Design a protein around this ligand. Structure first.
Ligand SMILES: COc1ccc(S(=O)(=O)N(Cc2cccnc2)[C@@H](C(=O)NO)C(C)C)cc1
Ligand SMILES: [Ca+2]
Ligand SMILES: [Ca+2]
Ligand SMILES: [Zn+2]
Ligand SMILES: [Zn+2]
Length: 173
């Protein structure tokens, strides 16, 4: 149970995301922060590039929501299901979303803003689940969204690094 050895999530070299998440516990820049710490968490672990927007749909639509998606990935603030994103497909080709029934903070005041941010941005354009005992995919049950360590480990860095990585030679198509 971990990254898919032989199936890279995104292949392009320029991904983009949409900051559709937000909360009183995090103003635009704060929720956008987790979208920036998450996005950057994997944008830095890999050489891939990333852009942003707020219309149509980027590569990782980061949006806030709860038990009310329609008939699938049902959230539940009042439940371990803190957040999640989608996989490579049609529009769900990268889309994260933060629970909207509890709260998200960069520090340890609400939940784990960028923690679950790189968790979902890491989910679609990052990896599956690396040794997050230190990484970002398993800190949630603790504190590390901004306090004084807030960052990914070498195992999630490994999974995402397995996502993108250094170029072999062909600099362009
Ligand atoms: C920062 O690392 C983590 C982020 C989010 C979660 S989660 O939201 O609790 N959850 C994992 C999980 C919940 C309940 C039982 N077992 C695992 C999300 C998740 O990890 N999404 O990528 C589930 C609901 C998809 C935990 C750690
Ligand atoms: Ca929940
Ligand atoms: Ca997408
Ligand atoms: Zn959702
Ligand atoms: Zn996960």
């Amino acid at each position: 149970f971990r990254t898919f050895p032989g199936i890279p999530k995104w292949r392009k070299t320029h991904l983009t995301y949409r900051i559709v998440n937000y909360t009183p516990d995090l103003p635009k820049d704060a929720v956008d922060s987790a979208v920036e710490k998450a996005l950057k968490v994997w944008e830095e672990v890999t050489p891939l590039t990333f852009s942003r927007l707020y219309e149509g749909e980027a590569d990782i639509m980061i949006s806030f929501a709860v038990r009310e998606h329609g008939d699938f990935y049902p959230f539940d603030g009042p439940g371990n299901v803190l957040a999640h994103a989608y996989a490579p497909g049609p529009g769900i080709n990268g889309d994260a979303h933060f629970d909207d029934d509890e709260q998200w903070t960069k520090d340890t005041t609400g939940t784990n803003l960028f923690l679950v941010a790189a968790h979902e941005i890491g989910h679609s354009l990052g990896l599956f689940h690396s040794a997050n005992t230190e990484a970002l995919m398993y800190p949630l049950y603790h504190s590390l969204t901004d306090l004084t360590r807030f960052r990914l480990s070498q195992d999630d860095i490994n999974g995402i690094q397995s996502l993108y990585g250094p170029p072999p030679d062909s600099p362009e198509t």
